[PDB]
Design a protein around this ligand. Structure first.
Ligand SMILES: C/C=C(/C)C(=O)O[C@H]1C(C)=C2[C@H]([C@@H]1OC(=O)CCCCCCC)[C@@](C)(OC(C)=O)C[C@H](OC(=O)CCC)[C@@]1(O)[C@H]2OC(=O)[C@@]1(C)O
Ligand code: ALF
Ligand SMILES: [Mg+2]
Length: 994
């Protein structure tokens, strides 16, 4: 039934044609069960083991490096016995790394908790219905409940489905709807209709929502909707349909390989144009079948030279280490890719209760009457410190500590708070903290009484377990609570009947202690207590009292206020009719006003500061809460989201108000407003989405089940360490410490990491440039292969793979948190940096090819072959005449190729020092600042030797160690790089900007 909250009890029964007295028939149940399905949230299992892997290859650069791997195997057959000892060493290491990351890849992702699983933990296994099937109530499987069922709920019960309340059995039905509002306070339901068809959950006080629980009372209702058609279902649907977007960095990479596929494809065809001068001459020394082999080989070369493999492993390494670092800072990162995105945050959306606040109601102000005299009435106001349920704190009179026991009014105020209470305190020994037992607004009263210690009870030596209710028990010993007149909706107050301890039932001196909404209570008072005396309530006194209640109830504190009173001469136990509550208000009459207490859920101590720091980093903070607007705005002023006196008419909205604005208005509203109150779960995700429609990287921080959709939606969802499992499993990070401050340090860590990732992302890609310049030259220039695609891999995995990981340790800046969030679009390489790496790029390309063509012409132990007979090195065994000198097997010699690889390596070992800073001369910025980089270059050079000496290696790589005569040469061809880029680093920093 849609909109059951807007209809009457009769209309709802009619709608399904059911009897409140008998319930559905076995037929009706079967028909409904088929028409609506089972009352269950569809389970969503994670991707299978097979999927995870396949998804691994889904990457373009990965599918291009795989295609080349195949062509590298198809042509792995065509080979003779000269090198028949190593023919498939390439098709091996090419797919070895592919399946290496693929496998490991799934070793991180397949390890994740499911949010819907956690969510279904709010689904009860059992429910209670009245089926025509039989007379007494049946207890069946919740999933077997259907719309139209007549259900019964009782205190402690976890509501089975979205139900329209039919009849409330007790005086009141109290419900905890924190899974939908994040507020634990008991909501008092009723059965009357709620007209507005757009009423938010907080407004549907005639409905019971699946997943919530009964705090107190017994009720009968009719099921309106089940399964995914419930409020918890919408939460479930927003979490199912999600799939976090690709981080900003991943997009830059996906863009890179998006072009690499175009550039390479274009370079191949490019070289093709330079191979038309051999197609003309009518020669049969190379058929088409053979003629194609050339291209498929040069292609596999370009691919392995372009695709900067190894990077995917360098990144994962930096992040993994960062995560360990952040964990030390109390920030558990569940999604590595989010670490980078957190530094790029411009807006932080935050839940209020239990996130910005402690979620522990605390009484911080209270007053009693001082003296009365005609139109003059003065109050004794006090303040109480303490923001938790712990009995730690003091009572302040004018900011100066005092003893409550001195004031008689406070002895009575405390007596009422201890007696007119159904809650208590408890010390959780396992957790080492004090926790409430029962309602929060009542435990605040319990806690206040322990702090006041109006009878000066000796408590310093009691165990924390016994300290929890010490002072309350003392008071419970003075008066016996005969019975309590439970709260009534038409009274807004509650009272308890008490007789003196150790007196006869006939004895005189009984009292009623009242607690309630100030208006009603104060109006039933005809007297005001003064110390231990009592004088008549008069217009002046009443106005004095109501004036301060008004200030406290709506100010910069907007506190929940309770008036405490007592009936000095209550009715005789007998003449009281307890079974009829409409008679209670009259019993709670002729009252003596005693005092007022003011409470609120405080903010966490370190939140104002944390938000100021966020502001410094150019990050805005917005509040989105299910709690009411008045207290939401109050808290916003207390933590600095609003000015103590700022006008917020257009800067704060309730969910309902927001829903009224048209779409374009809603959007703009998210840019202007900083406080959204009395919202529903989907309102939070919608706000985050609007924020994202302006291309802002938004973080969401919360602790409730109602925060899940938004947490899921935000680029960076951050859950409170001591919050719900649902929130945690939907987040990218968890603040084990529960401090907002931690978020700030995580953003800082996020900015620093990316800065370092920026360098080694350039370093590696840079290297890959010089490589392609090489393969390009020795492709349209005729020359033999200076470097084979089976060597590059090792270089881009171990040679550069080490300096990279070393760069991820560059010392971060100081002004890191004084600059505004960087744009998601900010490119890695462009402008002068595009050219600077273009020069170094082509350079290495010819720096290697030059060392190869050097071992021939201007060489030593090599044939001084002329450049012409060098480029035509092919025509040797076919054209002996023209081209002739030595043996035709000196080209594929392990010398020329082993001369270019030494250059490439020596260059990149110098380029890693050039990447220690964008526009900074290595001389100005000591290349030894990063000790891990120096030691890194060593391990690479040593491994460059090891890949020569130990024969089992240079065999597959086709390399041969060089001596001083040759090695000294490399140092003089690569070393000049600390100049080109050195001069270039001067240009930008002296002719562009700094
Ligand atoms: C792997 C190696 C290379 C050389 C490659 O093809 O990189 C190109 C390329 C695809 C881009 C370019 C390279 O393009 C050129 O250098 C122009 C053509 C000259 C080649 C001559 C043939 C020998 C990057 C690498 O380099 C330079 C030095 O100019 C910079 C940048 O890349 C980034 O910002 C890094 C993103 C991870 C990208 O223009 C980028 O395309 C984009 O979409 C960007 C925005 O990304
Ligand atoms: F704790 Al909330 F909205 F769920 F402030
Ligand atoms: Mg909360």
């Amino acid at each position: 039934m849609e909109a059951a909250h807007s209809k009457s009890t009769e209309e709802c029964l009619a709608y399904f044609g059911v009897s409140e007295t008998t319930g559905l028939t076995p037929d009706q149940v079967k028909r409904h069960l088929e028409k609506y399905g089972h009352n269950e949230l569809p389970a969503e299992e994670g991707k299978s083991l097979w999927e995870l892997v396949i998804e691994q290859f889904e990457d373009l650069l990965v599918r291009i490096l795989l295609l080349a791997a195949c062509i590298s195997f198809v042509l792995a057959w065509f080979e003779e016995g000269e090198e028949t000892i190593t023919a498939f060493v390439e098709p091996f290491v090419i797919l070895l790394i592919l399946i290496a990351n693929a496998i490991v890849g799934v070793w991180q992702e397949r390890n994740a908790e499911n949010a819907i699983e956690a969510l279904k933990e709010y689904e009860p296994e059992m429910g209670k219905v009245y089926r025509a099937d039989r007379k007494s109530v049946q207890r069946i499987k919740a999933r077997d409940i259907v719309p139209g069922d007549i259900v019964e709920v009782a205190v402690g019960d976890k509501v089975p489905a979205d139900i329209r309340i039919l009849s409330i059995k007790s005086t009141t039905l109290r419900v905890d709807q924190s899974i939908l509002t994040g507020e634990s306070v008991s909501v008092i339901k009723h059965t009357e209709p709620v007209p507005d068809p757009r009423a938010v959950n907080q407004d549907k006080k005639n409905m019971l929502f699946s997943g919530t629980n009964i705090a107190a009372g017994k009720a009968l209702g009719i099921v309106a909707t089940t399964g995914v058609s419930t409020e918890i279902g919408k939460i479930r649907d927003q979490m199912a349909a999600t799939e976090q977007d690709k981080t900003p960095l991943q997009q830059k990479l996906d863009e890179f390989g998006e072009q690499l596929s175009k550039v390479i494809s274009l370079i191949c065809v490019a070289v093709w144009l330079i191979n038309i001068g051999h197609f003309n001459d009518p020669v049969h020394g190379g058929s088409w079948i053979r003629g194609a082999i050339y291209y498929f080989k040069i292609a596999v070369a370009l691919a392995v030279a372009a695709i900067p493999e190894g990077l995917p492993a360098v990144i994962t390494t930096c992040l993994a280490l960062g995560t360990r670092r952040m964990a030390k800072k109390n920030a558990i990162v569940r999604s590595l890719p989010s670490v980078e995105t957190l530094g790029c945050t411009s807006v932080i959306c935050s839940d209020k209760t239990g996130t910005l606040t402690t979620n522990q109601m605390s009484v911080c102000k209270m007053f009693i009457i001082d003296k009365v005299d005609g139109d003059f009435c003065s109050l004794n106001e006090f303040s109480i410190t303490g923001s938790t349920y712990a009995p730690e704190g003091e009572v302040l009179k004018n900011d100066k500590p005092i003893r409550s026991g001195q004031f008689d009014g406070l002895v009575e105020l405390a007596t009422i708070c201890a007696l007119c209470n159904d809650s208590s305190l408890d010390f959780n020994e396992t957790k080492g903290v004090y926790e409430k037992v029962g309602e929060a607004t009542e435990t605040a009263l319990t806690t206040l009484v322990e702090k006041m210690n109006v009878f000066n009870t000796e408590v310093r030596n009691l165990s924390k377990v016994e300290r929890a209710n010490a002072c309350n028990s003392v008071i419970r010993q003075l008066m016996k609570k005969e019975f309590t007149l439970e709260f009534s909706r038409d009274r807004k107050s509650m009272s308890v009947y008490c007789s003196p301890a150790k007196s006869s039932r006939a004895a005189v001196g009984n009292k009623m202690f009242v607690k309630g909404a100030p208006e009603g209570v104060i109006d039933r008072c005809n007297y005001v207590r003064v110390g231990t005396t009592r004088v008549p309530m008069t217009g002046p006194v009443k106005e004095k009292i109501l004036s301060v209640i008004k200030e406290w109830g709506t100010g910069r504190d907007t506190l929940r206020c309770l008036a405490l009173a007592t009936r000095d001469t209550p009715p005789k136990r007998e003449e009281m009719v307890l079974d009829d509550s409409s008679r209670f208000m009259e019993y709670e009459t002729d009252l003596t006003f005693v005092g007022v207490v003011g409470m609120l859920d405080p903010p966490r101590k370190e939140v104002m500061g944390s938000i100021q720091l966020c502001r410094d980093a150019g990050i805005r903070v917005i509040m989105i809460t299910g709690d009411n607007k008045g207290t939401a705005i109050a808290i916003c002023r207390r933590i600095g989201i609003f000015g103590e006196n700022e006008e917020v008419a257009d800067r704060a909205y309730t969910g309902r108000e927001f829903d009224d604005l048209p779409l374009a208005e809603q959007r703009e509203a998210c840019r202007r407003a900083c406080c959204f109150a009395r919202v529903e779960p989907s309102h939070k995700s919608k706000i985050v989405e609007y924020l994202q429609s302006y291309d802002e990287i938004t973080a969401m921080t919360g602790d409730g089940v109602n925060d899940a959709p938004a947490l899921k939606k935000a680029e960076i969802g951050i859950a409170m360490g001591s919050g719900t499992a649902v929130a945690k499993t939907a987040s990218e990070m968890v603040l084990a410490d529960d401090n907002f401050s931690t978020i700030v340090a995580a953003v800082e860590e996020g900015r620093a990491i990316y800065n370092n990732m920026k360098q080694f992302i350039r370093y590696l890609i840079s290297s890959n440039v010089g490589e392609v310049v090489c393969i390009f030259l020795t492709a349209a220039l005729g020359l033999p292969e200076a470097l084979i695609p089976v060597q590059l891999l090792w270089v881009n995995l171990v040679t550069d793979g080490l300096p990279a990981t070393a760069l991820g340790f560059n010392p971060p800046d100081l002004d890191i948190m004084d600059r505004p969030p960087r744009s998601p679009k900010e490119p890695l390489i462009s402008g002068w940096l595009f050219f600077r790496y273009m020069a170094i790029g082509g350079y290495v390309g010819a720096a290697t090819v030059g060392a190869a063509a050097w071992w021939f012409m201007y060489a030593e132990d090599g044939p001084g072959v002329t450049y012409h007979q060098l480029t035509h090195f092919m025509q040797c065994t076919e054209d002996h005449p023209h081209f002739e000198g030595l043996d035709c097997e000196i080209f594929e010699a392990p010398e020329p190729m082993t001369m270019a690889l030494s250059v490439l390596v020596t260059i990149e070992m110098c380029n890693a020092l050039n990447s220690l800073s964008e526009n900074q001369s290595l001389m100005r910025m000591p290349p030894w600042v990063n000790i891990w980089l120096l030691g890194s270059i060593c391990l690479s050079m040593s491994l460059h030797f090891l890949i020569l000496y130990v024969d089992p290696l240079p065999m597959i790589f086709k390399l041969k160690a060089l001596d001083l005569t040759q090695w000294l040469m490399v140092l003089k061809i690569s070393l000049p790089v600390i100049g080109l880029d050195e001069i270039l680093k001067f240009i930008a920093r002296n002719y562009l900007e700094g």
